[PDB]
Amino acid sequence: WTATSGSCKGRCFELQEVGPPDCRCDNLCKSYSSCCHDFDELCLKTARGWECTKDRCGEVRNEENACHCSEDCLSRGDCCTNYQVVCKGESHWVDDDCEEIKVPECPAGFVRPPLIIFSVDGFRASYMKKGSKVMPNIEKLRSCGTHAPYMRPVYPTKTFPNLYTLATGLYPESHGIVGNSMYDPVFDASFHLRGREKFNHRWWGGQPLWITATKQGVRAGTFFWSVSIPHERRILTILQWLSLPDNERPSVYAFYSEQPDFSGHKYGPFGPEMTNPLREIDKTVGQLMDGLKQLRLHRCVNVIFVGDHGMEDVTCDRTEFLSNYLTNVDDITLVPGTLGRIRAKSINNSKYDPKTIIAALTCKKPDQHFKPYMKQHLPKRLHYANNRRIEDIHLLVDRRWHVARKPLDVYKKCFFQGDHGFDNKVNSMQTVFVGYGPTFKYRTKVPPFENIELYNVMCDLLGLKPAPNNGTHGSLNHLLRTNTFRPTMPDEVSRPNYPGIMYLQSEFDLGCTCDDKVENKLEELNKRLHTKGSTKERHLLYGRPAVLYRTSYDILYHTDFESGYSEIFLMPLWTSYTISKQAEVSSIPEHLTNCVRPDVRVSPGFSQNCLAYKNDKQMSYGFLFPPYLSSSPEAKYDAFLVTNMVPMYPAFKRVWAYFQRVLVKKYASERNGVNVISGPIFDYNYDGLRDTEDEIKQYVEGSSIPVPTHYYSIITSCLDFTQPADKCDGPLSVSSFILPHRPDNDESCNSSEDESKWVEELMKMHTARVRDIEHLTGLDFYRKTSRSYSEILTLKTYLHTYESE
Ligand SMILES: *[C@@H]1O[C@H](CO)[C@@H](O[C@@H]2O[C@H](CO)[C@@H](O[C@@H]3O[C@H](CO[C@H]4O[C@H](CO)[C@@H](O)[C@H](O[C@H]5O[C@H](CO)[C@@H](O)[C@H](O)[C@@H]5O[C@H]5O[C@H](CO)[C@@H](O)[C@H](O)[C@@H]5O)[C@@H]4O)[C@@H](O)[C@H](O[C@H]4O[C@H](CO)[C@@H](O)[C@H](O)[C@@H]4O[C@H]4O[C@H](CO)[C@@H](O)[C@H](O)[C@@H]4O)[C@@H]3O)[C@H](O)[C@H]2NC(C)=O)[C@H](O)[C@H]1NC(C)=O
Ligand SMILES: NC(=O)N1CCCc2c(n(Cc3cccc(OC(F)(F)F)c3)c3ccccc23)C1
Ligand SMILES: [Ca+2]
Ligand SMILES: [Ca+2]
Ligand SMILES: [Cl-]
Numbered sequence: 129w130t131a132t133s134g135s136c137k138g139r140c141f142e143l144q145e146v147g148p149p150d151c152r153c154d155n156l157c158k159s160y161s162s163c164c165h166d167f168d169e170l171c172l173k174t175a176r177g178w179e180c181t182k183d184r185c186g187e188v189r190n191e192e193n194a195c196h197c198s199e200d201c202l203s204r205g206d207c208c209t210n211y212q213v214v215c216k217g218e219s220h221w222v223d224d225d226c227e228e229i230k231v232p233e234c235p236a237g238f239v240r241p242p243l244i245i246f247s248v249d250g251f252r253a254s255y256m257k258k259g260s261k262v263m264p265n266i267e268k269l270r271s272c273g274t275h276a277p278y279m280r281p282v283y284p285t286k287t288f289p290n291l292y293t294l295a296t297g298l299y300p301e302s303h304g305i306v307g308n309s310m311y312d313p314v315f316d317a318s319f320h321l322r323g324r325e326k327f328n329h330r331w332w333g334g335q336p337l338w339i340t341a342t343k344q345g346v347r348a349g350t351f352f353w354s355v356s357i358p359h360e361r362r363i364l365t366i367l368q369w370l371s372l373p374d375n376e377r378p379s380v381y382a383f384y385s386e387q388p389d390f391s392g393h394k395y396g397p398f399g400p401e402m403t404n405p406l407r408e409i410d411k412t413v414g415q416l417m418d419g420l421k422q423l424r425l426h427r428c429v430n431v432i433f434v435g436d437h438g439m440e441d442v443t444c445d446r447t448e449f450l451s452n453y454l455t456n457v458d459d460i461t462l463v464p465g466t467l468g469r470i471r472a473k474s475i476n477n478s479k480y481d482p483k484t485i486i487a488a489l490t491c492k493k494p495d496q497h498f499k500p501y502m503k504q505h506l507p508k509r510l511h512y513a514n515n516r517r518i519e520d521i522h523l524l525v526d527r528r529w530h531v532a533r534k535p536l537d538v539y540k541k542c543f544f545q546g547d548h549g550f551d552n553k554v555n556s557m558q559t560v561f562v563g564y565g566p567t568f569k570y571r572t573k574v575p576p577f578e579n580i581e582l583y584n585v586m587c588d589l590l591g592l593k594p595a596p597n598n599g600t601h602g603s604l605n606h607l608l609r610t611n612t613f614r615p616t617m618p619d620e621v622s623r624p625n626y627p628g629i630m631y632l633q634s635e636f637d638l639g640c641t642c643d644d645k646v647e648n649k650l651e652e653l654n655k656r657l658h659t660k661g662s663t664k665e666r667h668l669l670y671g672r673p674a675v676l677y678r679t680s681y682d683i684l685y686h687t688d689f690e691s692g693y694s695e696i697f698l699m700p701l702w703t704s705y706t707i708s709k710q711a712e713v714s715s716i717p718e719h720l721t722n723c724v725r726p727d728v729r730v731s732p733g734f735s736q737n738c739l740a741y742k743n744d745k746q747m748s749y750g751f752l753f754p755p756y757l758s759s760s761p762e763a764k765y766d767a768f769l770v771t772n773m774v775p776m777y778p779a780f781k782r783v784w785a786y787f788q789r790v791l792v793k794k795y796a797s798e799r800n801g802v803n804v805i806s807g808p809i810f811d812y813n814y815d816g817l818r819d820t821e822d823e824i825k826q827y828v829e830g831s832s833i834p835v836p837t838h839y840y841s842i843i844t845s846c847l848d849f850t851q852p853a854d855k856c857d858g859p860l861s862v863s864s865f866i867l868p869h870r871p872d873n874d875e876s877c878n879s880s881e882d883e884s885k886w887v888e889e890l891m892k893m894h895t896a897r898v899r900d901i902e903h904l905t906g907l908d909f910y911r912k913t914s915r916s917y918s919e920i921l922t923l924k925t926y927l928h929t930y931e932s933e
């Protein structure tokens with residue numbers, strides 16, 4: 129209940145919301161049906177519109193006007209944003225040359241440069257170039273400030289997940305806003321775009337920037353605007369707040385525009401109708417910047433212009449229907465559209481079965497435009513599984529498509545021509561970032577980066593300590609002129625052992641065999657040096673990874689590769705090796721096909737055994753350093769050490785063998801040598817973090833050999849490919865992947881074909897950041913380079929996407 133008979137006099141857009149049933153005058157009061165009776169009259173004035181004209185200059189203040197052109201308006205802080213242009217002969221901000229802002233130039237009493245976040249819904253990255261002729265204010269922010277060619281949103285590429293990701297630095301699985309629509313089975317409640325449930329604070333996890341600022345004594349404008357408040361009034365309200373006394377004035381503000389998204393849905397991302405919405409957004413930016421210039425704040429404020437997601441061409445005719453695949457369609461609930469999430473319609477129906485639903489949805493039609501997944505099997509780069517609000521069954525929908533349950537859903541709900549939500553690597557889903565102000569760099573282009581990184585930087589801009597989040601603090605220091613965050617590398621927690629030869633062959637009873645008993649001081653001293661680390665500088669180019677948790681492990685050196693061998697998991701945590709452009713591929717000689725050799729540096733009790741693999745009818749094994757890339761027939765024996773072996777399903781061995789035999793050499797040719805680090809990942813609770821021993825759900829039958837859920841590789845070379853990977857003087861280049869370790873290749877519809885037709889496509893789907901692998905393994909890479917640590921942090925957040933331009 130609201131007793132709406134109080135008054136908004138002197139309270140318009142008040143910053144602290146008053147409690148029920150007292151009536152509200154804050155920018156959200158309309159959304160709660162709670163404004164005072166006179167809110168419209170007092171707070172939403174419109175008379176005479178939004179611009180001064182020649183004949184209004186010096187007018188007698190009329191308090192009814194939307195904004196003012198009277199002489200006292202500057203010190204009232206309520207002039208129309210074009211006041212000084214129309215009436216005092218000033219230029220528009222956009223018509224001024226840009227001049228580097230080396231220091232904040234702020235009015236007296238400003239403790240810090242304010243931060244204004246100008247967010248645009250559905251602003252696709254390519255609009256910056258394609259709409260540049262009609263967006264001169266935005267183009268000036270872009271060219272004069274710091275900009276990225278695009279910013280990667282989070283998945284799903286919808287509004288609510290992305291804006292709350294911007295606000296918190298968190299993946300949706302962690303912040304809890306995992307779609308625009310959600311069912312939470314613990315609450316037994318639903319979240320929807322329309323309605324009241326979304327206002328309940330139990331949905332919203334982590335700590336958003338406005339709460340972060342308030343807790344640390346930095347005042348925040350309210351970030352939310354009821355939909356009926358026009359853009360011009362939002363801008364004027366911000367400008368009015370910036371005129372408050374020092375003790376009352378916020379330091380951070382947000383503006384939000386529902387455009388261009390609103391129009392993009394109706395007309396598609398490049399519909400001829402899209403020009404006007406782009407012009408109108410630019411005009412709004414112009415009003416803000418003219419308004420700041422009037423207040424002498426245009427070389428004081430840091431402005432961020434940022435989008436939440438792009439927009440793709442999608443029409444009603446490009447809809448797949450689950451009723452064309454499933455017999456039981458009425459026993460499921462689907463969250464539909466540019467992604468699918470399926471759960472049982474009724475929890476009392478014990479005949480519902482996810483295994484048969486997935487199978488009925490797998491590779492059933494030749495050009496099927498969605499792919500079903502158990503959530504834990506989704507590409508790890510999406511970080512979309514660790515939340516009870518994310519249904520076990522997920523459909524990744526092809527760009528340009530929808531999924532729906534039955535045709536009646538699409539016509540008893542063509543309207544739309546645009547939509548978004550798809551995989552966040554899709555070019556059309558990329559969005560925009562520009563930073564302009566004293567704290568950002570001047571005329572600087574930076575590489576694309578993920579929106580999860582921005583919360584940290586917004587905290588840096590305001591002198592706040594960020595709450596714990598998924599950004600990598602420091603990875604965006606190259607955006608900033610000052611206020612950088614200078615992190616130190618994490619300390620290694622476990623130091624390695626360096627075992628020498630400690631065991632005789634006959635102490636091992638592993639059921640392994642090798643045809644290796646074929647008998648020289650020239651080469652005897654040589655093998656010894658290699659086992660002591662003489663080639664290590666060649667194969668371990670960036671220092672050994674640091675182990676950031678408590679465990680027992682050994683460094684093992686070899687001619688062709690170096691490993692960190694875990695005595696706990698009975699396999700390497702990592703295996704590092706370098707392949708030059710010149711390297712040659714050989715085959716596994718016949719007499720060595722089933723060779724596994726005990727490692728006399730490592731106890732039988734800390735070794736895998738061959739008998740377990742013989743006994744386990746489902747599980748085979750592979751090797752981390754590939755025998756195909758051995759430097760010589762003699763070095764090849766090292767590759768068959770039991771300490772280089774890892775458990776692998778036969779179906780996965782197809783993938784792995786193709787990567788090792790064909791792709792590594794291919795990359796070394798193309799990149800001028802590569803350094804490779806490969807290893808296992810265990811993430812049985814799909815939280816994106818390294819499993820402890822007691823979390824492992826599967827072992828090789830009859831043994832303590834844990835089965836990895838994934839295998840990773842980190843592939844590094846010189847950014848200047850005129851230099852070989854092992855003699856690189858400058859910046860590095862990386863690509864990585866986290867391949868799911870699956871007992872079938874059902875994920876790849878063309879897997880009956882030769883690996884050359886499907887494996888690389890699978891690997892590209894499972895592209896990863898080095899950082900993703902760090903979380904999954906508890907390792908810290910690139911500890912020893914000649915590069916600055918912030919530059920290494922940027923490299924560790926890089927994702928190779930394989931999208932075209
Ligand atoms: C991305 O960044 C984020 C932020 O850093 C990373 O997430 C953190 O990861 C930590 C490890 O998983 C986790 O730390 C745990 O904290 C638990 C207390 O959590 C509450 O308090 C914090 C602080 O304010 C709060 O943020 C939490 O918020 C979560 O839950 C609420 C309510 O449900 C949601 O609204 C909110 O969105 C958020 O949900 C997300 O996280 C939870 C996990 O906490 C998931 O379940 C959700 O799906 C969702 O993703 C909480 O309100 C604390 O209980 C934990 O302690 C356990 O382990 C320690 C070892 O240190 C030990 O002392 C105890 O034994 C204890 O175990 C006990 O509980 C077990 C489970 O019931 C049980 O098995 C045992 O027997 C024990 O009884 C733990 O320390 C931290 O909370 C999150 N933070 C956030 C915001 O998500 C994330 O990892 C990063 N991702 C990547 C890939 O890097
Ligand atoms: N009516 C409205 O005001 N909005 C439209 C509805 C969806 C929405 C808005 N905001 C607030 C917001 C505005 C501008 C930037 C921003 O992000 C930043 F905090 F990072 F700056 C956040 C949200 C924050 C979290 C989740 C959903 C939303 C806005
Ligand atoms: Ca949006
Ligand atoms: Ca885990
Ligand atoms: Cl959704």
Ligand SMILES: [K+]
Nearest residue numbers: 741744747748
């Ligand atoms: K087997």
Ligand code: NA
Nearest residue numbers: 873874876879
């Ligand atoms: Na297949």
Ligand SMILES: [Zn+2]
Nearest residue numbers: 250389393548
């Ligand atoms: Zn939209």
